[PDB]
Design a protein around this ligand. Structure first.
Ligand code: NAG
Ligand code: NAG
Ligand code: NAG
Ligand code: NAG
Ligand code: NAG
Ligand code: NAG
Ligand code: NAG
Ligand code: NAG
Ligand code: NAG
Lengths: 109, 122, 124, 122, 123, 124, 109, 124, 109
C-alpha cells in the first residue's frame, strides 16, 4: 500500500502539498502516479494522470511532481469547493497492477 | 518400419513416427522433373505456412486452443487413438476439415493479439 | 457526458454469489479497457480487477484470483462481474472505471478515467 | 474483407487482416510459368529467412527489442495507428528501412548469445 | 568481413557471423539450366530448414540441444575446440560421426515433443 | 488380476539412503502411469511420487523434491524409488499405485486403480 | 490436507454420508475426487473415481457427489464388510498434485 | 601480472548514491566475467553482483536487486557498480573479481580468481 | 549462508581439516565448491577452485574434497606463513548464485 498523511489543511489563497510515498518497485520505476479526488457521498474523479499531466476540463491549480520515491500533488488557490478525500494510485508492474494509498482529508479554513 | 510403414498401425502408434514421413516430403523429363520439383516445394511450403499461421511452426505435434466439437466426431479417445488408423480418421473428419482450419486460424489471431498486449504492460 | 451505470443486487448472504452489470454510453465501448475498483465503508479505494478492451485478458488482485470473474460484451456495451463465495471482507461500494491498460497500438494509460456511480455490495 | 481489402483501411484495422494477405503470397510458356513460380518461392523464402534471423520465425506480429528512433518518424501512436494507412506509412519510412532491418539482426544476435549463456549457467 | 570472411577464424570468433553466411543461401537451354540451379538451391535450403525443424531448432542460428557429447567422437577440450580451431578442421574431424549425431538429435526432439504434449494434458 | 509385488525393506539410518523396487503383472505395463503413496504408521495417506508411462517425467511433493528419485524400467516391468538423506518424518508404509496421470492420447485418470501391498520404511 | 470427519457410524440397513471439504483450487475447479477404502492391515482399494463414477466390480451401494467446495461419499446399508477407513483424494492441479485427507472410521452397530 | 584497482568509495549519507570503478590490467578484459563481492568490517564475504564478459547480462542478490546496477565498458577497461538508494546495512569493503560466469564456449569458471584490492564504502 | 566452524587451531607439521557444510540443493547438487584464503590486512585470494583442483602458483600443500553434503580443505603440514582467514563458497544455482561460508581463524601455536 501507499502512504499518505491522514489530513492536510490551509486557508484560501495559499498552496498545499499532499505526499505519496512508495517503494522503488512501484513509485520509482513506473512514472504513472495518478491522483483522484473523491467528494463525500459521490464517486471519484481524475485530477492528474501519468505523473505531471492533466486531463482537459480540470483547472490549472492541481499539479504534480515526483522526486526519488516520493510523489506529490500540489493544490493552489483553495477555492473551498475541494472538500474531498485525495488518493494516489500507482502502477506497480505485473501481478500487482495498481496500489492506492489511504485517503487524505483536505480541510479549507 | 520405413516410409508410411505405420499406415496400418493405430493413430497413437503412427503418431510416434512422424519424422519418417516428414523427411520424405522433399526435353522430355527436364521440364517435367522441374515441374515436379517446384510442385513438391510449393506443397511443402503451403503446409509449412499453414502450420505457421496456426502458431505451430517448427513442431510436428502441436497442441492448440480450439475445443473439439462433438458434432465433428463423438467417439472417445479409446476408439480414435487405440482402435483406428489415420486413413479411417481422414475419411471420418474430411467434411469438417476446413471448418477446423478456420477456427485454428482465428484462435491464433486472438492469441497473437493478446500476447502483444501483455508485452505492452510495462 | 460519459455515463456508467452499475446494476445488481445489494444484499447477499455469506457463501453465496452475485452478478453485477455495468452499462456504458457516450464513447466507443470496445476501444477502452475496463476495471472494477472497490471502497470499503470505512476504508479507501482498492482495485478489484481489470479487463482488456477486446475482453480476452483479465487480471485480479491476489485475494480474489479464485473467486471473481470479470467479463464484457462489446456488442451490448455491457461489463459484467461474477463474484463467488463473496466473503465478509468484500463488502464495499464497487465502481466501474474506464482505463488501466491499452491495446499496444494506442497510447498508454495506466490510470482510471471515467468513474461510475457505484453499487453497494453488502455481505450479511 | 478479402485479399488486400484493408489496403485503404486504418493501420490498426488493417493489422487484423494479415492472414488473408499472407495466404495469397504462395515449352517456352512452361519456362515462363516456372520462372514466375520459382521467383514467388524465392521471394517468400527470403522474407521468411529475414524473419528468421530476426527471431520472428512463425509469427505474423513479432515484438522486438529495438527502440524506435524519433528521427525516423516523430509521430505519436494515434497519428500512425488510428489515422494512417500502411501505404502512407511505408512511404513515410522507406528511406530508413534498410537501416532498421540491420539493427534488428544485431539485436537478435545478441539475444541468441544471451540465451546460449543462460542454458549453460547451471 | 562479409561472406565466408570468418573462414580462417576460430569457431568461437566465427560463430558471431552466422547471419552473414545464412543470408547467402537464397539468390531454352539456359532457362532450364538456371531454373534447375535455383530449384536446387531452394531444395537444399528447405532440407536444412526441415532438418532444423525436426530437431526443435527452427528459427534459430545457435540452438542448444539436450544431447550429451560423447568423448569417442572427439575428446578435445573447449580451450582447443573453440579457441584454437577453425570450422573446416572441426567439420573434417567429426565427419565420420555426423549421421549418429543427427539421429540422436531427432530422437531427442521426438521425446521432448511427446513430453511437452503430456505436460499440457495435465489439467 | 493385477498384482503389484514390492520387495524393498526397512532398516535405515536417520541420514541413510535406501532403494525400493516394485514388480507388476496382470496388465500392459508400458501404458499406465505409476505413483508412490506413503502412509505413516497409524496416520493417513500421502502422495509421494509420480512417473509417466515412458519414465521421462517425474513429479514430487515439495518435501522430497530434492531427495527422491523415481525411475521405471518398462522392459523388465519394474518401478524403483531411490531415497537419499531422508528424515524422521519418512516413517511409513510405501505403496505402488497405477494411475495418477495419463498421456494426452489416452483417457484421463487422476486416480489410482490398483494398490500394491507395500513395504514399511522405518528410520532408526 | 483436506478436512474430513474423524468418524461416522450407523446401523445396518441405514445410509451415511462422509463429507470432505477442500478449497476452490482443490475441489471446486477440479472434479476428480476419488475415494479409497482401507481395511486395517490391508492396502487400500479404489471405490469412487471422479465425483459420481464408480469402478467396475465395486458394489453398487457406493456413490458420491460434489457441490461447491464440498464432496461427499454416500454409502447404503452397512454390511459387516464395510468396516474400514475412507480417504479422499483431490487433484489439486500441477505443482502439488494430490492431497489425501484423514481417515474416517466407519462403525457398524 | 594481473591487477585490479578499485578507484571509488568513501563516506556517504543515507539516501545518496555512490559509484565504484574497478580498472583491470594485465589480461584480456573482454574475455572474463566479473563480479562484486562485499565484506562488512566485522563479517565475512558476501557475493553481490555478477556481469558476463560481453556485459549484456546482470545478476544480483535479492537484497540489492532494485538498488544496484553493474556495468562494463569493454573498450576502456572498467567494471563499474552504481549503488543507488543505499542503507546502513551496506557498509563494507567492496571487491571486484574476475569470475563467476563463462562465455558457454570456454570451460566453466564458477570461482573468483584474480581479486582486486577493495574500496571502502561507509554509510552514516 | 553456509555453516563453517568459527575457528580452528593447528600445530606446524600436523594436518588440519577445515570443514564446510551446506544443504542438498546447493553444495550437493552443484559440484563447484571453492576455498579462499584472506590474510587479515589483504584482499582474499583463491586456494582451491572446484572441489579438488588447484591454480598455478599456489603451493601443493593445499587440496580439498567433498563428500555427501560436506566439504573439507586439507593444507598438509602447517607453515608459519599460513596465518589467515579461510572461506568456503559454493555455486547454488541460477537464482541464489554464490553462497559464502563464514570465516575460520587458523591459529598456529
Ligand atoms: C496389425 O494389427 C494386428 C492386430 O490385428 C497387430 O497385432 C499388429 O501389430 C498390426 N501391425 C502393424 C504393422 O501395425
Ligand atoms: C460428407 O458429406 C457427405 C454428403 O453430405 C456424407 O454422405 C458423408 O457421410 C460425409 N462424410 C463424413 C461424415 O465423414
Ligand atoms: C474508408 O474510410 C471511411 C472513413 O473515411 C470508413 O468509414 C470506411 O470503413 C473505410 N473503408 C475501408 C475499406 O477502410
Ligand atoms: C537516431 O537517428 C539519428 C539520425 O539517423 C542518429 O544520428 C542517432 O544516433 C539515432 N539515435 C540513437 C539513440 O542512436
Ligand atoms: C497526437 O498528435 C496530434 C497532432 O495533431 C494531436 O492532435 C493529438 O492530440 C496527439 N495525440 C495524443 C497525444 O495522443
Ligand atoms: C528519401 O530519400 C530521397 C532521396 O534522397 C529524398 O528525396 C526523400 O525526401 C527522402 N525521404 C525522407 C522521408 O526523408
Ligand atoms: C588469422 O589468424 C590471425 C592470427 O593467426 C588472426 O589475427 C586473424 O584475425 C585471422 N584472420 C581472420 C579473418 O580471422
Ligand atoms: C559413445 O560412443 C561409444 C562408441 O562409439 C559407445 O560405446 C558409447 O556408449 C557412447 N556413449 C554415449 C553416447 O554416451
Ligand atoms: C586441453 O588439452 C591440451 C592438451 O591437449 C592442454 O594443453 C590444455 O591446457 C587443455 N585445456 C584444458 C582447459 O584442460
Amino acid at each position: 500500500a501507499l502512504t499518505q498523511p491522514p489530513s492536510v489543511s490551509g486557508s484560501p489563497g495559499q498552496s498545499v502539498t499532499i505526499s505519496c510515498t512508495g517503494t522503488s518497485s512501484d513509485i520509482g520505476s513506473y512514472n504513472y502516479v495518478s491522483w483522484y479526488q473523491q467528494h463525500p457521498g459521490k464517486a471519484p474523479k481524475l485530477m492528474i494522470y501519468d505523473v505531471t499531466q492533466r486531463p482537459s476540463g480540470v483547472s490549472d491549480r492541481f499539479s504534480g511532481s515526483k522526486s526519488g520515491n516520493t510523489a506529490s500533488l500540489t493544490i493552489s488557490g483553495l477555492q473551498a469547493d475541494d472538500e474531498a478525500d485525495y488518493y494516489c494510485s500507482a502502477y506497480a508492474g505485473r501481478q500487482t497492477f495498481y496500489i492506492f494509498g489511504g485517503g487524505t482529508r483536505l480541510t479549507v479554513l | 518400419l520405413g516410409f508410411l510403414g505405420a499406415a496400418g498401425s493405430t493413430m497413437g502408434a503412427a503418431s510416434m513416427t512422424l519424422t519418417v514421413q516428414a523427411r520424405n516430403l522433399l526435353t522430355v523429363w527436364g521440364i517435367k522433373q522441374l515441374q515436379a520439383r517446384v510442385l513438391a516445394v510449393e506443397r511443402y511450403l503451403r503446409d509449412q505456412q499453414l502450420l505457421g499461421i496456426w502458431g505451430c511452426s517448427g513442431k510436428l505435434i502441436c497442441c492448440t486452443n480450439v475445443p473439439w466439437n462433438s458434432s465433428w466426431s463423438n467417439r472417445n479417445l479409446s476408439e480414435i487413438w487405440d482402435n483406428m488408423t489415420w486413413l479411417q480418421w481422414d475419411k471420418e473428419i474430411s467434411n469438417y476439415t476446413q471448418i477446423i482450419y478456420g477456427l485454428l486460424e482465428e484462435s491464433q489471431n486472438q492469441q497473437e493479439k493478446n500476447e502483444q498486449d501483455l508485452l505492452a504492460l510495462d | 457526458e460519459v455515463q456508467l451505470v452499475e446494476t445488481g443486487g445489494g444484499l447477499v448472504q455469506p457463501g453465496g454469489s452475485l452478478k453485477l452489470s455495468c452499462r456504458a454510453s457516450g464513447y466507443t465501448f470496445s476501444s477502452f479497457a475496463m476495471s472494477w475498483v472497490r471502497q470499503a465503508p470505512g476504508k479507501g479505494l482498492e482495485w478489484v480487477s481489470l479487463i482488456n478492451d477486446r475482453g480476452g485478458l483479465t487480471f485480479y488482485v491476489d485475494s480474489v484470483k479464485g473467486r471473481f470473474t470479470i467479463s464484457r460484451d462489446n456488442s451490448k456495451n455491457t461489463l459484467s462481474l461474477q463474484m463467488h463465495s463473496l466473503r465478509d471482507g468484500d463488502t464495499a461500494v464497487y465502481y466501474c472505471a474506464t482505463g488501466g491498460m491499452s491495446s499496444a497500438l494506442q497510447s498508454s494509460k495506466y490510470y482510471f478515467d471515467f468513474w461510475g456511480q457505484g453499487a453497494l455490495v453488502t455481505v450479511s
